Amino acid sequence: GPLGSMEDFVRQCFNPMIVELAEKAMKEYGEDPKIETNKFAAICTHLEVCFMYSDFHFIDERGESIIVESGDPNALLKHRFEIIEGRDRIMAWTVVNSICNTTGVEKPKFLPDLYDYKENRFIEIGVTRREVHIYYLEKANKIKSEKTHIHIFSFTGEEMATKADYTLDEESRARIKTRLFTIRQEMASRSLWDSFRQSE
Ligand SMILES: [Ca+2]
Ligand SMILES: [Ca+2]
């Protein structure tokens, strides 16, 4: 087949808010989305996963955890997750600080991806083109000390999470894995996949 551009794939296959947030994140760290293109696509993917992880999950009027797929939820419902990723550094730490003072949870040394109000913990999400156990160990060894929960997804459907605790129901994680499969398949049809996989 013909080789497509990863730029084209990213703008066609991710929603514009994700793409924009990804561009902003790369600029913030001095990376150009038009050169580190595989990285661009990885950052978009990771962002989307963070959003999909939190999608639909609320804490009900009584304070337990429920799933609603409407577009208009009950306005007394609280979002189960805070989303830290996608925010610029100042706002990300502002949110982390607010969570920590309120819930009294310990302050992390690096910005995590999410906060889970049900489980009362920060979450580090990862999406890897390699084996989940290796990526898992890399992440665990970076965070130094841990209350932060780690949840790793791969493009082939494997997961690994701290203490074999996967946080979400199978259906939610299936949505995410289905999306990752679709990303991989679409990259493959544009002949972008083998390279994307090898660049991590
Ligand atoms: Ca980030
Ligand atoms: Ca992050």
Is residue 85 annotated as a catalytic residue, yes or no? Answer: yes
Is residue 113 annotated as a catalytic residue, yes or no? Answer: yes
CA of 86 to the centre of ligand 2 (A): 8
Record the tokens describing residue 153, joined without a space: 């997804």
User: Active-site residue among 23, 39, 82, 139?
Assistant: 139
CA of 194 to the centre of ligand 1 (A): 24
Nearest C-alpha neighbor of 114 from the set 168, 33, 35? 168
User: Active-site residue among 23, 48, 85, 116?
Assistant: 85
Nearest C-alpha neighbor of 110 from the set 133, 141, 134, 135? 141
Is residue 163 annotated as a catalytic residue, yes or no? Answer: no
User: Active-site residue among 113, 116, 124, 177?
Assistant: 113
Strand partners, 57: 67
DSSP code of 87? Answer: S
Number of CB atoms found within 10 A of residue 75's CB: 5
Strand partners, 153: 127, 159
- What distance lies between CA 49 and its chain's CA centroid? 4
DSSP code of 173? Answer: H
Asked if residue 114 lies in contact with residue 141, where contact means CB atoms within 8 angstroms, the answer is no
Q: What does 97-137 look like in DSSP terms, one character per residue? A: HHHHHHH-PPPPSS--SEEETTTTEEEEEEEESS-HHHHHH
Strand, helix or coil at 180? Answer: helix
Nearest C-alpha neighbor of 155 from the set 55, 38, 57? 38
Strand pairing class (81-83; 114-116)? antiparallel
